[PDB]
């Protein structure tokens, strides 16, 4: 039995503390906390000790969580599908961070808030957001040279398990 340390990184507001909470418990809130969580999972017969790590809040202070990158087996890199800014930052900001702190460690690319992305109403109502299309994700995924791109939504739970399965797959293989 291996150990997988799986850190989720991304901008603020892109919603990970929710993806993590929802994967782990099948809920969706409203404070909002994901304490470090580890548990045994069986993948294809052999059993695996999976560790889930949130980075919420270190978008603000570089020294807040010194433990995020140390020995990480895989990243989940999330951007919000209703935010062109988080889309641009994957490239401009996150890839250099990971290239530096944990070189050669796999990245699962994930777009969040699937459920808002073709909500015509939501965008007239929040003029500043911009939907990212699945193509643009795919395109981005190739660009940063990550193995797989999943879109998901912690409100509906769509593809959430998919993501972590993919994080696990890539560490094992």
């Amino acid at each position: 039995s291996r150990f997988i340390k799986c850190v989720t990184v991304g901008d603020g507001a892109v919603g990970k503390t929710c993806m993590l909470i929802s994967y782990t418990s099948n809920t969706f809130p409203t404070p909002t906390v994901f304490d470090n969580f580890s548990a045994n999972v069986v993948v294809d017969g052999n059993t695996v000790n999976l560790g889930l790590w949130d980075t919420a809040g270190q978008e603000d202070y570089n020294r807040l969580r010194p433990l995020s990158y140390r020995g990480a087996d895989v990243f989940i890199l999330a951007f919000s599908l209703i935010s062109k800014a988080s889309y641009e930052n994957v490239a401009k900001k996150w890839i250099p961070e990971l290239r530096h702190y944990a070189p050669g460690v796999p990245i699962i690319l994930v777009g969040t808030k699937l459920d808002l992305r073709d909500d015509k109403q939501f965008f007239i109502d929040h003029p500043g957001a911009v939907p990212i299309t699945t193509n643009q994700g795919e395109e981005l995924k190739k660009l940063i040279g990550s193995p797989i791109y999943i879109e998901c939504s912690s409100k509906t739970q769509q593809n959430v398990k998919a993501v972590f399965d993919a994080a696990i797959k890539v560490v094992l293989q």
Partner: protein
């Protein structure tokens, strides 16, 4: 509430391995992480200069008491004396709060409470105001790189020079609080134990960690740490940190002739001055990860989050201060 304390402490005894087998982490690092995750969670919502909502303040208060309690019990077990009403002296062993926890815990709580208060000094009228990030008025308004925060605005054409006097008075009040916390954070990590893993990863000799260029410099006849540094590339934070890591490794080797060691230590001090906001070093990251001592775990972990709050708040003051500078400028 007892129902809700129970959940909290119980998950710390697992630590954090949800599947029994305490294969898994230390009550220390369970603690450290939990303090971190709580603070992150709570101040993640301080997105504006205003009092922490009263319900939040309440929750932060109790859960932080909970996490801090183990320290009430960490002691020194020390011989002593006591004499009776009748006059007989009796040798006893007495108990007392362990050294670093007696002064620092109170000290850290007073900083916590000072942060919370500076935010209370925002209860009621503020000559500045926030617009939601996704609404039209937002799109017209340092900001573009943190797309998630609400854009602050200040009245067209400056803001009152009382309202700006005060914000400076608070940018300073808070910077001094930040520095205090960091000073405690610093102290603990230096009194933390050097991990067996870290030693193991160390090179053969001083000239391997510093490598031969830098080795010649801490090794010639003259030396003055000020010049030493003016001769190296310190353009980036990554570069300064790579040096810090090389100096630290050497020191740790030599404490297991002493001239170098003394100079090496003189150089680190100079770094901590010139480069105060520096991310933590390979050794600190390691001290923390393999640390088994819950006394220090609570100490370093708690000073760390306070460091961060103070910084969050002074960013929120710099946010307004500077969209103020921009207001005077676009008045041209």
């Amino acid at each position: 509430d007892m129902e809700m304390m129970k959940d909290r402490f119980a998950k710390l005894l697992l630590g954090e391995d949800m599947s029994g087998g305490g294969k898994g982490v230390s009550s220390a690092l369970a603690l450290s992480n939990a303090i971190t995750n709580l603070a992150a969670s709570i101040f993640g919502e301080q997105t504006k200069l205003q009092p922490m909502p009263q319900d939040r303040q309440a929750r932060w208060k109790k859960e932080i008491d909970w996490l801090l309690s183990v320290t009430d019990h960490i002691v020194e077990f020390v011989p002593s004396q006591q004499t009776s009403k009748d006059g007989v002296c009796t040798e006893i062993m007495v108990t007392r709060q362990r050294g670093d926890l007696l002064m620092n815990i109170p000290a850290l709580r007073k900083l916590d409470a000072m942060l919370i208060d500076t935010l209370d000094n925002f209860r009621g009228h503020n000559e500045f105001w926030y617009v939601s990030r996704d609404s039209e008025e937002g799109q017209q308004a340092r900001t573009n790189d943190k797309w998630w925060l609400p854009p602050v605005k200040v009245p067209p054409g400056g803001l009152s020079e009382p309202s700006r006097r005060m914000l400076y008075f608070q940018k300073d009040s808070v910077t001094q609080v930040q520095k205090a916390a960091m000073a405690i954070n610093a102290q603990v990590l230096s009194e933390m134990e050097i991990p067996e893993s870290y030693i193991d990863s160390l090179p053969k000799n001083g000239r391997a960690s510093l490598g031969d260029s830098i080795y010649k410099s801490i090794t010639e006849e003259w030396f003055d740490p000020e010049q030493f540094l003016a001769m190296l590339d310190m353009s980036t934070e990554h570069k300064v940190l790579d040096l810090k890591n090389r100096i630290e490794a050497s020191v740790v080797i030599w404490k297991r002739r002493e001239l170098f060691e003394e100079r090496a230590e003189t150089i680190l001090v100079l770094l901590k001055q010139k480069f105060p906001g520096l991310p933590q070093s390979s050794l600190d990251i390691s001290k923390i990860q393999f640390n088994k001592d819950v006394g220090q775990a609570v100490l370093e972990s708690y000073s760390r989050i306070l460091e961060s709050l103070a910084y969050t708040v002074m960013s929120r003051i710099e946010d307004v201060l500077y969209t103020d500078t921009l207001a005077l400028k676009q008045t041209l």
